[PDB]
Ligand binder design. Structure first.
Ligand SMILES: CCCCCCCC/C=C\CCCCCCCC(=O)OC[C@H](COP(=O)(O)OCC[N+](C)(C)C)OC(=O)CCCCCCC/C=C\CCCCCCCC
Ligand SMILES: CCCCCCCC/C=C\CCCCCCCC(=O)OC[C@H](COP(=O)(O)OCC[N+](C)(C)C)OC(=O)CCCCCCC/C=C\CCCCCCCC
Ligand SMILES: CCCCCCCC/C=C\CCCCCCCC(=O)OC[C@H](COP(=O)(O)OCC[N+](C)(C)C)OC(=O)CCCCCCC/C=C\CCCCCCCC
Ligand SMILES: CCCCCCCC/C=C\CCCCCCCC(=O)OC[C@H](COP(=O)(O)OCC[N+](C)(C)C)OC(=O)CCCCCCC/C=C\CCCCCCCC
Ligand SMILES: CCCCCCCC/C=C\CCCCCCCC(=O)OC[C@H](COP(=O)(O)OCC[N+](C)(C)C)OC(=O)CCCCCCC/C=C\CCCCCCCC
Ligand SMILES: CCCCCCCC/C=C\CCCCCCCC(=O)OC[C@H](COP(=O)(O)OCC[N+](C)(C)C)OC(=O)CCCCCCC/C=C\CCCCCCCC
Ligand SMILES: CCCCCCCC/C=C\CCCCCCCC(=O)OC[C@H](COP(=O)(O)OCC[N+](C)(C)C)OC(=O)CCCCCCC/C=C\CCCCCCCC
Ligand SMILES: CCCCCCCC/C=C\CCCCCCCC(=O)OC[C@H](COP(=O)(O)OCC[N+](C)(C)C)OC(=O)CCCCCCC/C=C\CCCCCCCC
Ligand SMILES: CCCCCCCC/C=C\CCCCCCCC(=O)OC[C@H](COP(=O)(O)OCC[N+](C)(C)C)OC(=O)CCCCCCC/C=C\CCCCCCCC
Ligand SMILES: CCCCCCCC/C=C\CCCCCCCC(=O)OC[C@H](COP(=O)(O)OC[C@H](N)C(=O)O)OC(=O)CCCCCCC/C=C\CCCCCCCC
Ligand SMILES: CCCCCCCC/C=C\CCCCCCCC(=O)OC[C@H](COP(=O)(O)OC[C@H](N)C(=O)O)OC(=O)CCCCCCC/C=C\CCCCCCCC
Lengths: 198, 198
């Protein structure tokens, strides 16, 4: 309601801002004119300075690039050749190493896997009997536990009857007057709050 | 009142739970004993068979492992020799490359750096002139910037004071009845808060 009075001061604030938006911004533009003029005194020389330097720079760089490229060509080629022969020697080494070791590894695998074929096979079979006996134990006690659980579930359901019936009715018998009392407190609160929030 | 009866049902449940857990832990343990006894008997054969068989298992594996290690060491010697002799050539030939190609690198680096010296020296010197021009403009423009900024700041301070006092006093003057009316509503609303929760 009184916001009009407060906002009126905001309008005055806008006016004060507009006063600055004029000469201050205009002055800023005048400063910008100095900035642009300055840049036209800096960049004018800078750009030419760059051009007059980039040319010999790229030229000197080209010289260095040439030195590097030529030097690298006279290095990469012979080195690659030597590395190739060295790699071929390494390859031959690898071949002459991985071949006997490969055959050996295959026999190693034979001696290991065939061993496993005669180690894990009876092991799994033994485990099968062991697991079977264990399964029977789990089924014996499990089947009993199922009966026990069913009995306990029955006891639990029976002990739940005294909760889902009398206790639930008791809760309902409590909820009725409670909700009523809550309603009285809520209704009054609603009116009371509305009266002060109007 | 509600909590008293509700919690009563809780204790009337904990008791039943305790009366249930009693035989439950026993029945569970009885079944657990049957299982664990069987597991023990089973584990007796399990561990014994595993240990009795682990002996020839390890013996078989170690036997082959001996061959694996022996043949490995047997071949490791000539293989290491191939690596050593081969590397001797590879490294020696490379050392014979790092020498001339290294000298060439240094010689190329000489021209590389020396050409850089004859370029970077005047480049940085001329850059000093460029930077001088930049700094000159930055100083001259800066002097204006600061002068204008001071002017703009003064203009800002003028409108600032026109708001820090008149507008602020308007706000503060309004804050008086506003805060008071708010206090009136808050203090009165506080009645409901207490008369509804106690
Ligand atoms: C319609 C347009 C109208 C114009 C209205 C503009 C609205 C903003 C209005 C008022 C707030 C300004 C108050 C700031 C006063 C400080 C000025 C100052 O002196 O400042 C520089 C100093 C640091 O200098 P120092 O190292 O020498 O001092 C530290 C000392 N030690 C190193 C030396 C030992 O810093 C400090 O005081 C730190 C101050 C903390 C900054 C508070 C700013 C609060 C305002 C807005 C929040 C902005 C969030 C940003 C969102 C992005 C928007 C684009
Ligand atoms: C001698 C002179 C010296 C230099 C002086 C300054 C001059 C100004 C120029 C460059 C420097 C400013 C850089 C600011 C970024 C620019 C963004 C921008 O303006 O972009 C747009 C451009 C153009 O695209 P277009 O389609 O319009 O033009 C079509 C192509 N037309 C032009 C070629 C024919 O886009 C591009 O140039 C594409 C680039 C996007 C790159 C993507 C991949 C980034 C990967 C890795 C970076 C991280 C490295 C980190 C590792 C180091 C850790 C220490
Ligand atoms: C010392 C001097 C020499 C140094 C060597 C020069 C280094 C540079 C050379 C090669 C770079 C290799 C790295 C690339 C990585 C990606 C591998 C990849 O893409 O992997 C996934 C594929 C998927 O299968 P696919 O059916 O789609 O591909 C069929 C392959 N296709 C189409 C080619 C027939 O799998 C494959 O390519 C299967 C890969 C299995 C490779 C088996 C042969 C291994 C040979 C020798 C053993 C060496 C022992 C010595 C080690 C010592 C080193 C110091
Ligand atoms: C101690 C006495 C208790 C014995 C049972 C009596 C009532 C169960 C009471 C309490 C259990 C605790 C809460 C379990 C949560 C289930 C809520 C429900 O209602 O979930 C229905 C939705 C249906 O969704 P759907 O149609 O897409 O899936 C159909 C399923 N299909 C694709 C997967 C195979 O399923 C789901 O959320 C996923 C779960 C579906 C599980 C169904 C297993 C029913 C097993 C036995 C019922 C027969 C009891 C009779 C035995 C004689 C007793 C004297
Ligand atoms: C029909 C509806 C029935 C619902 C289903 C049954 C759920 C079981 C529910 C309730 C149990 C019976 C109620 C007994 C009530 C009182 C228990 C008690 O006296 O409470 C207090 C204790 C100790 O007080 P505090 O240390 O907390 O306080 C620190 C002390 N102060 C506060 C001074 C700083 O609290 C403790 O002992 C906290 C327990 C310790 C954490 C045990 C973690 C168990 C994990 C998994 C369960 C599976 C076990 C089987 C797996 C075994 C494999 C070998
Ligand atoms: C007939 C049928 C045959 C089957 C029979 C075999 C089944 C039983 C299985 C295994 C044999 C159990 C061994 C007997 C019990 C003793 C357990 C124990 O205590 O033995 C002691 C070891 C050593 O102790 P230490 O190393 O400290 O001492 C070494 C420190 N020295 C350097 C300082 C001196 O302890 C250990 O072996 C404990 C290591 C286990 C915990 C590893 C932690 C893994 C953590 C993270 C993995 C990431 C999961 C994330 C998801 C990724 C999935 C891919
Ligand atoms: C314009 C172009 C001109 C062309 C002309 C060429 C001639 C110039 C010649 C050589 C300059 C290349 C220098 C390479 C970088 C050396 C880094 C370094 O100082 O290294 C040795 C140090 C000493 O060890 P420290 O533990 O005592 O020192 C660390 C402990 N503190 C800090 C406490 C003292 O650190 C180590 O050895 C630790 C290992 C980490 C360093 C790995 C070396 C990485 C090399 C190059 C990176 C760039 C690859 C890209 C280039 C490829 C282009 C195709
Ligand atoms: C588009 C792509 C192409 C662009 C081309 C750009 C053209 C520029 C071309 C070539 C570079 C010329 C300019 C740089 C050469 C100046 C060398 C110099 O005179 O350096 C002086 C320094 C300081 O003197 P000090 O040795 O007594 O103090 C060291 C004291 N302490 C240990 C505490 C760190 O010496 C040191 O740092 C040396 C001792 C410490 C070792 C540092 C590692 C050096 C190796 C590799 C890293 C390279 C850094 C060079 C990057 C330059 C960027 C401009
Ligand atoms: C029947 C229906 C049932 C109703 C029941 C439910 C209601 C919830 C109940 C209670 C919650 C509030 C209780 C806490 C009372 C303390 C309030 C207070 O005075 O707390 C101030 C503290 C800050 O410490 P200090 O001032 O004492 O120490 C100053 C430093 N020394 C120590 C050197 C002096 O606060 C802090 O730590 C944290 C907050 C910091 C805030 C500072 C003020 C910022 C101002 C404006 C920004 C906007 C705030 C608006 C929030 C949005 C709301 C939607
Ligand atoms: C973290 C490390 C990252 C580096 C990883 C390197 C390993 C690479 C893996 C395998 C070898 C690959 C070897 C590849 C050699 C081929 C180099 C070449 O000519 O590449 C052509 C490309 C072409 O790019 P374009 O953008 O023109 O084309 C793409 C096209 N539009 C599209 O949509 O697909 O340009 C490029 O990719 C970029 C320019 C490269 C210039 C060459 C520059 C080479 C410079 C120097 C030589 C190398 C150093 C040797 C040192 C030994 C001597 C002392
Ligand atoms: C209608 C009338 C309006 C006029 C009202 C006038 C009332 C003025 C009264 C009080 C204003 C208080 C103005 C305080 C200004 C700064 C005051 C200041 O420097 O305080 C110093 C403290 C000290 O910090 P330290 O870290 O040094 O130590 C902590 C200290 N020991 C402790 O226990 O707290 O730091 C603090 O606690 C600072 C937290 C300040 C909280 C504000 C934090 C900023 C909160 C909000 C601003 C965000 C605005 C977002 C708007 C954008 C979208 C619209």
């Amino acid at each position: 309601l009184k916001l009009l009075d407060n906002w009126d001061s905001v309008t005055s604030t806008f006016s004060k801002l507009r006063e600055q938006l004029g000469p201050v911004t205009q002055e800023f533009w005048d400063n910008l004119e100095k900035e642009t003029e300055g840049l036209r005194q800096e960049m004018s020389k800078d750009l030419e300075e760059v051009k007059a330097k980039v040319q010999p720079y790229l030229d000197d760089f080209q010289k260095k690039w040439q030195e590097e490229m030529e030097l690298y060509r006279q290095k990469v080629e012979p080195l690659r050749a030597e590395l190739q022969e060295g790699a071929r020697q390494k390859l031959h080494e690898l071949q002459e190493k991985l071949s006997p070791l490969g055959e050996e590894m295959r026999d190693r695998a034979r001696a290991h896997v065939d061993a496993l074929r005669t180690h894990l096979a009876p092991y799994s079979d033994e485990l099968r009997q062991r697991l079977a006996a264990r399964l029977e134990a789990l089924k014996e006690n499990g089947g009993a536990r199922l009966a026990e659980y069913h009995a306990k579930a029955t006891e639990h359901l029976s002990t739940l009857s005294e909760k889902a019936k009398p206790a639930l009715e008791d809760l309902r018998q409590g909820l009725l007057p409670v909700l009523e009392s809550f309603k009285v407190s809520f209704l009054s609160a609603l009116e009371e709050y509305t009266k002060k929030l109007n």
